[PDB]
Amino acid sequence: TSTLNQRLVPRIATRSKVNGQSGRMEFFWTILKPNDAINFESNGNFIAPE
Amino acid sequence: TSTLNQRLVPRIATRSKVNGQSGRMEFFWTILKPNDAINFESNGNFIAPEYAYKIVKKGDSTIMKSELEYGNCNTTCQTPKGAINTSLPFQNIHPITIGKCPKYVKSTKLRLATGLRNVPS
Amino acid sequence: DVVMTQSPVSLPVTLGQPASISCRSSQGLVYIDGNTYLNWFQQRPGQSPRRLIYNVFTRDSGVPDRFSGSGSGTDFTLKITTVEAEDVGVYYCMQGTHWPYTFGQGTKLEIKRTVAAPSVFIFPPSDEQLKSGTASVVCLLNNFYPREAKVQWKVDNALQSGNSQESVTEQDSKDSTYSLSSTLTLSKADYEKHKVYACEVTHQGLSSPVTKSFNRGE
Amino acid sequence: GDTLCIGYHANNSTDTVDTVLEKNVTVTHSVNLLEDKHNGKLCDLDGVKPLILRDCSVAGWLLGNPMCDEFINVPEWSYIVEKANPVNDLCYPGDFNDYEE
Amino acid sequence: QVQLVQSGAEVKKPGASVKVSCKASGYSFSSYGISWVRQAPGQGLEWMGWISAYNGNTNYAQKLQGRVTMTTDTSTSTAYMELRSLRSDDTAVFYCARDRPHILTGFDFDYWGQGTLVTVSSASTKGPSVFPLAPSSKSTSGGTAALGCLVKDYFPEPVTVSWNSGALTSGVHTFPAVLQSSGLYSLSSVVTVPSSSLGTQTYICNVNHKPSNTKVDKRVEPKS
Amino acid sequence: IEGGWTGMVDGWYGYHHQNEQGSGYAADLKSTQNAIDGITNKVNSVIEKMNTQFTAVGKEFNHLEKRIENLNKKVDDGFLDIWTYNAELLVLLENERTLDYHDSNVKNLYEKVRSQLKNNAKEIGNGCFEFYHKCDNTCMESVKNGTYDYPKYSEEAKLNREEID
Amino acid sequence: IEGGWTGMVDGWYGYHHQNEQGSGYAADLKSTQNAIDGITNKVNSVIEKMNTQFTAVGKEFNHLEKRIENLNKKVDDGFLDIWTYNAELLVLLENERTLDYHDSNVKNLYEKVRSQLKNNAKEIGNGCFEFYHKCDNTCMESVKNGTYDYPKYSEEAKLNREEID
Amino acid sequence: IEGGWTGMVDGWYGYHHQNEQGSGYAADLKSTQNAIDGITNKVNSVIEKMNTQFTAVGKEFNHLEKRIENLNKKVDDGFLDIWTYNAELLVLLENERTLDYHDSNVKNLYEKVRSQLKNNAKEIGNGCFEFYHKCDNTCMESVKNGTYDYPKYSEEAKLNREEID
């Protein structure tokens, strides 16, 4: 983003099946200023914003 | 690493020869989670890691700074200056303590008054 | 008022296994004197209670070093290393500094932790009491680790409850081995009404429940 | 004549207790909250010996300093004892980072 | 040194006053106080009261305040606990313990007494009816044939059973008495002796109910 | 009452009864016991200090001047020497409150005995009541138990005053 | 003065005038009004607490252990329970200061009346002035208004003393 | 003692001796000097304030909302207005302790002179001892130096009491 160039990584490690699903899905946010670009690049484990 | 993508640089600047060596060697650490990768890339001034401690039985502890011997007595507590086996609520000895150990106060005396002014005859 | 909660009521131990007994108070137990007051007590079965730790950190004159009173806040504990055999018995917290003095509930100790091997028996009534009017039959259980074996009573295949009464011995000093003697007393009329008096014993050492019939005419 | 008098308690407790108005006030009965009782010889905790790191600093034990190598596969320790001013282990010239962390 | 002698065992009917005495000596009685504790039959320990010999500072437990009356005879160094009104629920054994006299000072149940049990029910004393047992099915013949006597239908608690002139030593597992729901009692005293010695070993239950002095020597016979 | 009583080792606040029969030191049971209950509860409640949770907090410069360390350092060093001072004040505070509570109980008992006795006695000495009439051992108990009755001994006392009047 | 006056519902500090004509409860106007002004100003000024500015402050671990959150958390939790305690102390402080201020105003008025009356009256009771001479309703006002004059009634009072002397 | 002495400009606590020969204002040397030593040590010790070290601490938003600045800001602003209040309390505290210490020294000296003189004098006025007998200049020193002797002047004083008795 403008400043949040947050190059992240998944991690293959959780606990028991919560509500029938053992894996986790951490979600994110960012307040975005006008006329600003959000460069999303991923090749897995990514829940993209729509 | 997972998050510590710590792209560092050496610096060519120290003081006099300490123990016969003028240059410096800052060392590092990182707690590492299982199934995680550590991408080390360098083309100089790098002291690479070849051995590491597997963290096991994580349990309460500390790092005591005192010069004292070992005791043959299982005492409920240890402080840099000694051990404590009483029940009074607070200490003045040392903040750093082990498991069971009263809280730490910097006061010289904390006595609550529970009786009358003692005035004999 | 004060509430002394004793967490580990039932405490089987094996010889030489430091075990601990926790007493938790509703309010702080300090007093105007300055010292806390949780002198632990031990009433060895068949004997009168005895004192252990004066206040919270003072062993009594005739108390083994094994016994050790501990704790500073509402949660106090008592740990005895090398749990021995006279160590077994009931223990109580001490009365709170509040005048409501509260001993709390009790904590019982066991000698070791082996498995059960009971010798079950039953005793039909002699004709002597069978003439007084009362008719009672005794089921006997000589040795096993716990104090209960659910001796249930079937008269002509009909479970009998209430008419039964169970009495329990203590852990034999030689070998931790409690003994039981459930008795079921009934009138002569019920004795003559129903010939067949099967019990039923149930515990850990037995994968199969043992019932001994013992009919009226043998 | 018959008389009745009123009075408060007095003992021989030299206990000194301070107040807002006065200090070193001797009271009949008092409770103490602080304490300075410590043996001085570092004893054990719950039957768990500590990693008395003798002279070598905590860094040396971790970084594997050749002197003081005896402490490598020592089993679990209730706590870790480091002598101040580590002398035997110079840990070589260098500055450890994120140290107290 | 340690000598807190309690009074003798006492038996009464509901609604009658009871008086227990704990005489003390062998240790300085410098106004030291005395508190009394009750243990319901095989149940918890409940504190009942405390009296300071130094003063007349009684502290009867809220639960039981009207009935309970406590006294001290400094001259004989003897304390007394008196329950004016009796209840079947009150039936229990009572215990004594020393205490510190000054309220300012804390408490010390350093010495405890001999438990005076007190029974309270509307039932008169009755002699026990001893009845024998037999190895009908031979029991565990290859192990130990078991033989017993049943001491029943008696109202005071103290009973002493002697097996074969008391000479019998191991094998005896006298059991704790159980209140028959009609107010009486029933003991069971059994022995485990190998079925080898059926007639050679004599079997006699020599029981006595001390409060009624029913000294009765009962015969154990091996009916099979 | 500017003088302490060593003989009153049973309770704090007490009376020194003196009759034709003799002289003794009897502590007031309700005053001492109720006061002991309140003082003890003050003590145990004051103990509650409830330090902040152990929030697993440490950071350091990380070689990049992450003063979070010197911040978190000060924060802990500043919470102490502030709470400690504050705690020293609370001790001193409670100390005085117990002391003036004691003085108040004294004065309350002296008013109790004044209210019962009224003009049947002289206020003399440091809190001493000289009875014009003869308060018997029971009568001394009645004053203590709050069950003293002015009229019975009133007329006798009145004539004695008029004799010295 | 160990007893409160219920009849003096107009102001705090007052005088109970008694003449041959009658008896009333007159409050001192200047003492009460000035004291009310000072106490009210203390109250409103104490209210000023001026909490720290709302510096729009929040952070969290950000999944990278940014304890700035647990730091900023403690910081706010530590500022409270410290300021609150500190504020409890200031209340207690001001409380006493108002109470001793009141006692001081009492004693100041008693010295005022002593200074004016001097040996023209007897100090008797709990702050009562028995006039040897007869202070008229006006004379009672003059003592209150601070305009009392010793000489006029002096000689009459002096002879009365000598009569009982 | 409700009145201050302007003539006693040598020391705080003093005695106004009056003999047939004359009248003077003599300060008690040991009381004043010891008290001055203790008060001075209180003053210098209170000064010790030992502010936190200068930990070279400053940060700012760094254009990336690094509130470390507003954190470190509050931290310093919160340490002040807390320590300042706390220091104001310590001043007020020590202030009273010096004042009541002074009152205690007064009362201790008055008990000293009472203990020596006993029934050889009358307690009259605001801390004045009227000698039944004639305490000579030396005798006045002996009371001051603590070396006064009751028996020598006892019998003379006793007869004087009986004369006015």
PDB file of all heavy atoms in Angstrom, chain F residues 44-68:
ATOM      1  N   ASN F  44      -6.722  -7.379  56.850  1.00  0.00           N
ATOM      2  CA  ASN F  44      -6.775  -8.309  55.726  1.00  0.00           C
ATOM      3  C   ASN F  44      -7.186  -7.605  54.439  1.00  0.00           C
ATOM      4  O   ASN F  44      -6.676  -7.924  53.358  1.00  0.00           O
ATOM      5  CB  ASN F  44      -7.731  -9.458  56.038  1.00  0.00           C
ATOM      6  CG  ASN F  44      -7.346 -10.207  57.292  1.00  0.00           C
ATOM      7  OD1 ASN F  44      -6.289 -10.837  57.357  1.00  0.00           O
ATOM      8  ND2 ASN F  44      -8.200 -10.135  58.306  1.00  0.00           N
ATOM      9  N   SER F  45      -8.102  -6.639  54.528  1.00  0.00           N
ATOM     10  CA  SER F  45      -8.519  -5.932  53.324  1.00  0.00           C
ATOM     11  C   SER F  45      -7.396  -5.053  52.787  1.00  0.00           C
ATOM     12  O   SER F  45      -7.170  -5.000  51.574  1.00  0.00           O
ATOM     13  CB  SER F  45      -9.760  -5.092  53.607  1.00  0.00           C
ATOM     14  OG  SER F  45      -9.398  -3.900  54.279  1.00  0.00           O
ATOM     15  N   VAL F  46      -6.685  -4.376  53.685  1.00  0.00           N
ATOM     16  CA  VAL F  46      -5.540  -3.536  53.232  1.00  0.00           C
ATOM     17  C   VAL F  46      -4.557  -4.428  52.471  1.00  0.00           C
ATOM     18  O   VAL F  46      -4.011  -3.966  51.453  1.00  0.00           O
ATOM     19  CB  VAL F  46      -4.861  -2.808  54.405  1.00  0.00           C
ATOM     20  CG1 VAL F  46      -3.477  -2.303  54.032  1.00  0.00           C
ATOM     21  CG2 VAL F  46      -5.719  -1.668  54.927  1.00  0.00           C
ATOM     22  N   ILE F  47      -4.369  -5.669  52.921  1.00  0.00           N
ATOM     23  CA  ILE F  47      -3.353  -6.542  52.266  1.00  0.00           C
ATOM     24  C   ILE F  47      -3.656  -6.558  50.767  1.00  0.00           C
ATOM     25  O   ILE F  47      -2.704  -6.465  49.975  1.00  0.00           O
ATOM     26  CB  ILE F  47      -3.354  -7.968  52.842  1.00  0.00           C
ATOM     27  CG1 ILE F  47      -3.345  -7.978  54.371  1.00  0.00           C
ATOM     28  CG2 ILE F  47      -2.200  -8.775  52.270  1.00  0.00           C
ATOM     29  CD1 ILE F  47      -2.255  -7.140  54.980  1.00  0.00           C
ATOM     30  N   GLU F  48      -4.933  -6.676  50.401  1.00  0.00           N
ATOM     31  CA  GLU F  48      -5.280  -6.768  48.961  1.00  0.00           C
ATOM     32  C   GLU F  48      -4.477  -5.612  48.359  1.00  0.00           C
ATOM     33  O   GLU F  48      -4.645  -4.472  48.829  1.00  0.00           O
ATOM     34  CB  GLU F  48      -6.795  -6.746  48.775  1.00  0.00           C
ATOM     35  CG  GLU F  48      -7.476  -7.987  49.318  1.00  0.00           C
ATOM     36  CD  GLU F  48      -8.889  -8.208  48.808  1.00  0.00           C
ATOM     37  OE1 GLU F  48      -9.364  -7.377  48.009  1.00  0.00           O
ATOM     38  OE2 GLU F  48      -9.510  -9.211  49.207  1.00  0.00           O
ATOM     39  N   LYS F  49      -3.563  -5.943  47.449  1.00  0.00           N
ATOM     40  CA  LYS F  49      -2.765  -4.908  46.751  1.00  0.00           C
ATOM     41  C   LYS F  49      -3.019  -5.090  45.258  1.00  0.00           C
ATOM     42  O   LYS F  49      -2.839  -4.115  44.506  1.00  0.00           O
ATOM     43  CB  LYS F  49      -1.283  -5.057  47.089  1.00  0.00           C
ATOM     44  CG  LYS F  49      -0.878  -4.434  48.417  1.00  0.00           C
ATOM     45  CD  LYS F  49      -1.471  -3.062  48.649  1.00  0.00           C
ATOM     46  CE  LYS F  49      -1.062  -2.462  49.977  1.00  0.00           C
ATOM     47  NZ  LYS F  49      -1.414  -3.352  51.107  1.00  0.00           N
ATOM     48  N   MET F  50      -3.405  -6.303  44.856  1.00  0.00           N
ATOM     49  CA  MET F  50      -3.752  -6.531  43.420  1.00  0.00           C
ATOM     50  C   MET F  50      -2.845  -5.832  42.455  1.00  0.00           C
ATOM     51  O   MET F  50      -3.328  -4.974  41.690  1.00  0.00           O
ATOM     52  CB  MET F  50      -5.217  -6.061  43.192  1.00  0.00           C
ATOM     53  CG  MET F  50      -6.242  -6.892  43.930  1.00  0.00           C
ATOM     54  SD  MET F  50      -6.183  -8.627  43.421  1.00  0.00           S
ATOM     55  CE  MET F  50      -6.747  -8.491  41.726  1.00  0.00           C
ATOM     56  N   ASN F  51      -1.560  -6.191  42.469  1.00  0.00           N
ATOM     57  CA  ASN F  51      -0.579  -5.625  41.460  1.00  0.00           C
ATOM     58  C   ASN F  51      -1.131  -5.849  40.058  1.00  0.00           C
ATOM     59  O   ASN F  51      -1.956  -6.760  39.862  1.00  0.00           O
ATOM     60  CB  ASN F  51       0.770  -6.271  41.599  1.00  0.00           C
ATOM     61  CG  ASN F  51       0.773  -7.729  41.191  1.00  0.00           C
ATOM     62  OD1 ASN F  51       0.077  -8.546  41.789  1.00  0.00           O
ATOM     63  ND2 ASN F  51       1.546  -8.062  40.171  1.00  0.00           N
ATOM     64  N   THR F  52      -0.639  -5.067  39.096  1.00  0.00           N
ATOM     65  CA  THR F  52      -1.062  -5.234  37.681  1.00  0.00           C
ATOM     66  C   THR F  52      -0.750  -6.660  37.215  1.00  0.00           C
ATOM     67  O   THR F  52       0.171  -7.278  37.782  1.00  0.00           O
ATOM     68  CB  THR F  52      -0.403  -4.188  36.774  1.00  0.00           C
ATOM     69  OG1 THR F  52       0.988  -4.147  37.092  1.00  0.00           O
ATOM     70  CG2 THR F  52      -1.012  -2.813  36.925  1.00  0.00           C
ATOM     71  N   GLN F  53      -1.480  -7.149  36.211  1.00  0.00           N
ATOM     72  CA  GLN F  53      -1.277  -8.550  35.746  1.00  0.00           C
ATOM     73  C   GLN F  53       0.140  -8.686  35.240  1.00  0.00           C
ATOM     74  O   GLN F  53       0.767  -7.647  34.960  1.00  0.00           O
ATOM     75  CB  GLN F  53      -2.438  -8.924  34.787  1.00  0.00           C
ATOM     76  CG  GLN F  53      -2.287 -10.308  34.172  1.00  0.00           C
ATOM     77  CD  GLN F  53      -3.343 -10.596  33.133  1.00  0.00           C
ATOM     78  OE1 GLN F  53      -4.215  -9.775  32.861  1.00  0.00           O
ATOM     79  NE2 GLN F  53      -3.269 -11.776  32.541  1.00  0.00           N
ATOM     80  N   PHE F  54       0.643  -9.920  35.141  1.00  0.00           N
ATOM     81  CA  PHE F  54       2.022 -10.182  34.597  1.00  0.00           C
ATOM     82  C   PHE F  54       1.710 -10.246  33.090  1.00  0.00           C
ATOM     83  O   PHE F  54       1.370 -11.340  32.599  1.00  0.00           O
ATOM     84  CB  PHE F  54       2.564 -11.503  35.107  1.00  0.00           C
ATOM     85  CG  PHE F  54       2.727 -11.567  36.605  1.00  0.00           C
ATOM     86  CD1 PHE F  54       2.070 -12.532  37.350  1.00  0.00           C
ATOM     87  CD2 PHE F  54       3.535 -10.659  37.270  1.00  0.00           C
ATOM     88  CE1 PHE F  54       2.220 -12.589  38.727  1.00  0.00           C
ATOM     89  CE2 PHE F  54       3.684 -10.717  38.647  1.00  0.00           C
ATOM     90  CZ  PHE F  54       3.028 -11.682  39.372  1.00  0.00           C
ATOM     91  N   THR F  55       1.843  -9.116  32.391  1.00  0.00           N
ATOM     92  CA  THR F  55       1.466  -9.074  30.952  1.00  0.00           C
ATOM     93  C   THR F  55       2.629  -9.527  30.059  1.00  0.00           C
ATOM     94  O   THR F  55       2.671  -9.077  28.900  1.00  0.00           O
ATOM     95  CB  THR F  55       0.953  -7.677  30.585  1.00  0.00           C
ATOM     96  OG1 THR F  55       1.862  -6.722  31.131  1.00  0.00           O
ATOM     97  CG2 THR F  55      -0.437  -7.403  31.115  1.00  0.00           C
ATOM     98  N   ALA F  56       3.503 -10.408  30.558  1.00  0.00           N
ATOM     99  CA  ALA F  56       4.618 -10.921  29.733  1.00  0.00           C
ATOM    100  C   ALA F  56       5.182  -9.749  28.936  1.00  0.00           C
ATOM    101  O   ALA F  56       5.110  -9.790  27.693  1.00  0.00           O
ATOM    102  CB  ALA F  56       4.116 -11.998  28.809  1.00  0.00           C
ATOM    103  N   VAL F  57       5.728  -8.747  29.625  1.00  0.00           N
ATOM    104  CA  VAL F  57       6.160  -7.551  28.902  1.00  0.00           C
ATOM    105  C   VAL F  57       7.674  -7.348  29.014  1.00  0.00           C
ATOM    106  O   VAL F  57       8.182  -7.021  30.096  1.00  0.00           O
ATOM    107  CB  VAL F  57       5.410  -6.295  29.374  1.00  0.00           C
ATOM    108  CG1 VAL F  57       6.071  -5.119  28.822  1.00  0.00           C
ATOM    109  CG2 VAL F  57       4.000  -6.308  28.835  1.00  0.00           C
ATOM    110  N   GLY F  58       8.368  -7.426  27.874  1.00  0.00           N
ATOM    111  CA  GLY F  58       9.779  -7.023  27.746  1.00  0.00           C
ATOM    112  C   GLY F  58      10.085  -6.742  26.270  1.00  0.00           C
ATOM    113  O   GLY F  58       9.618  -7.458  25.378  1.00  0.00           O
ATOM    114  N   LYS F  59      10.883  -5.693  26.019  1.00  0.00           N
ATOM    115  CA  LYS F  59      11.400  -5.364  24.689  1.00  0.00           C
ATOM    116  C   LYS F  59      12.785  -4.765  24.945  1.00  0.00           C
ATOM    117  O   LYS F  59      13.159  -4.485  26.087  1.00  0.00           O
ATOM    118  CB  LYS F  59      10.469  -4.376  23.963  1.00  0.00           C
ATOM    119  CG  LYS F  59      10.776  -4.112  22.478  1.00  0.00           C
ATOM    120  CD  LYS F  59      10.975  -5.346  21.630  1.00  0.00           C
ATOM    121  CE  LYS F  59      11.571  -4.942  20.286  1.00  0.00           C
ATOM    122  NZ  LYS F  59      12.019  -6.098  19.468  1.00  0.00           N
ATOM    123  N   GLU F  60      13.568  -4.591  23.877  1.00  0.00           N
ATOM    124  CA  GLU F  60      14.891  -3.995  23.928  1.00  0.00           C
ATOM    125  C   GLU F  60      15.154  -3.203  22.669  1.00  0.00           C
ATOM    126  O   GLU F  60      14.368  -3.279  21.725  1.00  0.00           O
ATOM    127  CB  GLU F  60      16.001  -5.023  24.210  1.00  0.00           C
ATOM    128  CG  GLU F  60      17.428  -4.468  24.375  1.00  0.00           C
ATOM    129  CD  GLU F  60      18.126  -4.164  23.057  1.00  0.00           C
ATOM    130  OE1 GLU F  60      17.764  -4.777  22.034  1.00  0.00           O
ATOM    131  OE2 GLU F  60      19.036  -3.304  23.049  1.00  0.00           O
ATOM    132  N   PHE F  61      16.238  -2.417  22.643  1.00  0.00           N
ATOM    133  CA  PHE F  61      16.584  -1.686  21.424  1.00  0.00           C
ATOM    134  C   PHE F  61      16.689  -2.451  20.106  1.00  0.00           C
ATOM    135  O   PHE F  61      16.589  -1.830  19.041  1.00  0.00           O
ATOM    136  CB  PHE F  61      17.877  -0.905  21.687  1.00  0.00           C
ATOM    137  CG  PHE F  61      17.761   0.155  22.746  1.00  0.00           C
ATOM    138  CD1 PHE F  61      18.898   0.694  23.322  1.00  0.00           C
ATOM    139  CD2 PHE F  61      16.523   0.648  23.128  1.00  0.00           C
ATOM    140  CE1 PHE F  61      18.805   1.679  24.278  1.00  0.00           C
ATOM    141  CE2 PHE F  61      16.422   1.639  24.083  1.00  0.00           C
ATOM    142  CZ  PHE F  61      17.565   2.155  24.658  1.00  0.00           C
ATOM    143  N   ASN F  62      16.890  -3.773  20.150  1.00  0.00           N
ATOM    144  CA  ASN F  62      16.934  -4.623  18.947  1.00  0.00           C
ATOM    145  C   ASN F  62      17.985  -4.121  17.961  1.00  0.00           C
ATOM    146  O   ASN F  62      17.878  -4.353  16.754  1.00  0.00           O
ATOM    147  CB  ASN F  62      15.572  -4.751  18.251  1.00  0.00           C
ATOM    148  CG  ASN F  62      15.543  -5.855  17.186  1.00  0.00           C
ATOM    149  OD1 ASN F  62      16.240  -6.864  17.307  1.00  0.00           O
ATOM    150  ND2 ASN F  62      14.749  -5.658  16.136  1.00  0.00           N
ATOM    151  N   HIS F  63      19.000  -3.417  18.467  1.00  0.00           N
ATOM    152  CA  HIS F  63      20.097  -2.825  17.702  1.00  0.00           C
ATOM    153  C   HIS F  63      19.610  -1.698  16.787  1.00  0.00           C
ATOM    154  O   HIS F  63      20.425  -1.091  16.079  1.00  0.00           O
ATOM    155  CB  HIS F  63      20.860  -3.889  16.892  1.00  0.00           C
ATOM    156  CG  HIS F  63      22.074  -3.372  16.187  1.00  0.00           C
ATOM    157  ND1 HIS F  63      23.102  -2.732  16.844  1.00  0.00           N
ATOM    158  CD2 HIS F  63      22.422  -3.400  14.879  1.00  0.00           C
ATOM    159  CE1 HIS F  63      24.032  -2.388  15.971  1.00  0.00           C
ATOM    160  NE2 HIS F  63      23.644  -2.781  14.771  1.00  0.00           N
ATOM    161  N   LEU F  64      18.298  -1.436  16.804  1.00  0.00           N
ATOM    162  CA  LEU F  64      17.713  -0.364  15.954  1.00  0.00           C
ATOM    163  C   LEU F  64      17.094   0.705  16.860  1.00  0.00           C
ATOM    164  O   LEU F  64      16.113   1.341  16.428  1.00  0.00           O
ATOM    165  CB  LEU F  64      16.657  -0.987  15.038  1.00  0.00           C
ATOM    166  CG  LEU F  64      17.150  -2.122  14.143  1.00  0.00           C
ATOM    167  CD1 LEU F  64      16.070  -2.538  13.157  1.00  0.00           C
ATOM    168  CD2 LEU F  64      18.415  -1.717  13.401  1.00  0.00           C
ATOM    169  N   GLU F  65      17.631   0.872  18.070  1.00  0.00           N
ATOM    170  CA  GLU F  65      17.129   1.906  19.018  1.00  0.00           C
ATOM    171  C   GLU F  65      15.623   1.735  19.246  1.00  0.00           C
ATOM    172  O   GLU F  65      14.922   2.763  19.293  1.00  0.00           O
ATOM    173  CB  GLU F  65      17.456   3.312  18.507  1.00  0.00           C
ATOM    174  CG  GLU F  65      18.944   3.613  18.498  1.00  0.00           C
ATOM    175  CD  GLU F  65      19.324   4.971  17.932  1.00  0.00           C
ATOM    176  OE1 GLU F  65      18.442   5.637  17.358  1.00  0.00           O
ATOM    177  OE2 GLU F  65      20.503   5.354  18.063  1.00  0.00           O
ATOM    178  N   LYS F  66      15.168   0.496  19.449  1.00  0.00           N
ATOM    179  CA  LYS F  66      13.744   0.281  19.813  1.00  0.00           C
ATOM    180  C   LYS F  66      13.627   0.608  21.302  1.00  0.00           C
ATOM    181  O   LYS F  66      13.646  -0.330  22.119  1.00  0.00           O
ATOM    182  CB  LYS F  66      13.309  -1.148  19.483  1.00  0.00           C
ATOM    183  CG  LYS F  66      13.440  -1.516  18.012  1.00  0.00           C
ATOM    184  CD  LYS F  66      12.811  -2.841  17.652  1.00  0.00           C
ATOM    185  CE  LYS F  66      13.011  -3.208  16.197  1.00  0.00           C
ATOM    186  NZ  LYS F  66      12.491  -4.563  15.900  1.00  0.00           N
ATOM    187  N   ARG F  67      13.497   1.895  21.631  1.00  0.00           N
ATOM    188  CA  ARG F  67      13.459   2.337  23.050  1.00  0.00           C
ATOM    189  C   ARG F  67      12.257   1.713  23.766  1.00  0.00           C
ATOM    190  O   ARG F  67      12.124   1.929  24.982  1.00  0.00           O
ATOM    191  CB  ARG F  67      13.406   3.867  23.103  1.00  0.00           C
ATOM    192  CG  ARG F  67      14.663   4.564  22.606  1.00  0.00           C
ATOM    193  CD  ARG F  67      14.528   6.074  22.640  1.00  0.00           C
ATOM    194  NE  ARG F  67      15.745   6.731  22.184  1.00  0.00           N
ATOM    195  CZ  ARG F  67      16.056   6.942  20.909  1.00  0.00           C
ATOM    196  NH1 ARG F  67      15.887   5.980  20.020  1.00  0.00           N
ATOM    197  NH2 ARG F  67      16.529   8.115  20.528  1.00  0.00           N
ATOM    198  N   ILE F  68      11.425   0.949  23.053  1.00  0.00           N
ATOM    199  CA  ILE F  68      10.310   0.245  23.744  1.00  0.00           C
ATOM    200  C   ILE F  68      10.918  -0.299  25.032  1.00  0.00           C
ATOM    201  O   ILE F  68      10.255  -0.230  26.077  1.00  0.00           O
ATOM    202  CB  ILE F  68       9.738  -0.873  22.857  1.00  0.00           C
ATOM    203  CG1 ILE F  68       9.042  -0.304  21.618  1.00  0.00           C
ATOM    204  CG2 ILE F  68       8.820  -1.783  23.658  1.00  0.00           C
ATOM    205  CD1 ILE F  68       8.691  -1.343  20.580  1.00  0.00           C
TER     206      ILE F  68
END
